[PDB]
Amino acid sequence: KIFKPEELRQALMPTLEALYRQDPESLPFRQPVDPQLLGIPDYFDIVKNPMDLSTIKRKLDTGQYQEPWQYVDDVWLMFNNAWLYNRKTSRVYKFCSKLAEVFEQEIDPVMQSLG
Numbered sequence: 266k267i268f269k270p271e272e273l274r275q276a277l278m279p280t281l282e283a284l285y286r287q288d289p290e291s292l293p294f295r296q297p298v299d300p301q302l303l304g305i306p307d308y309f310d311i312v313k314n315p316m317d318l319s320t321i322k323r324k325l326d327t328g329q330y331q332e333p334w335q336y337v338d339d340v341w342l343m344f345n346n347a348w349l350y351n352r353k354t355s356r357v358y359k360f361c362s363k364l365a366e367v368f369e370q371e372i373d374p375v376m377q378s379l380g
């Protein structure tokens with residue numbers, strides 16, 4: 266099954282917008298983690314494939330997903346990086362869990378319609 270870029274934009278970008286709309290939880294995910302700004306030089310020792318909302322949005326805008334599961338996988342890469350690097354008590358970690366709950370609800374009917 267071949268998916269057109271605008272078909273993927275129209276279907277998937279609302280699920281990404283739902284994540285952006287989460288306040289306070291989306292704020293640290295709207296731009297790439299910057300270990301220099303944050304003073305965490307070990308970040309890229311632990312996270313080998315960084316991901317964030319702005320990168321996912323650019324990939325969707327530029328047709329880099331051929332197939333909707335590739336988009337789902339990048340969203341979960343974002344989540345898994347945050348749960349891997351951050352402490353269980355940290356805001357980023359708890360905010361990530363909220364973003365995953367929101368994403369689960371938004372993506373479910375969308376994937377069904379893309380099938």
Ligand SMILES: CO[C@H]1CC[C@@H](n2c([C@@H]3CCCC(=O)N3c3cc(C(F)(F)F)cc(C(F)(F)F)c3)nc3cc(-c4c(C)noc4C)ccc32)CC1
Nearest residue numbers: 292293294296297298299303305346347350351356357360
């Ligand atoms: C240019 O915009 C800015 C640049 C950077 C800022 N940034 C902060 C700042 C640093 C100062 C202390 C503080 O408290 N920060 C802070 C913490 C939060 C928290 F989410 F923890 F509540 C929210 C905010 C904000 F966005 F409201 F401003 C700032 N720490 C971050 C952690 C991550 C992260 C992830 C994901 N994975 O691993 C990590 C690590 C990513 C971004 C972060 C967010 C926005």
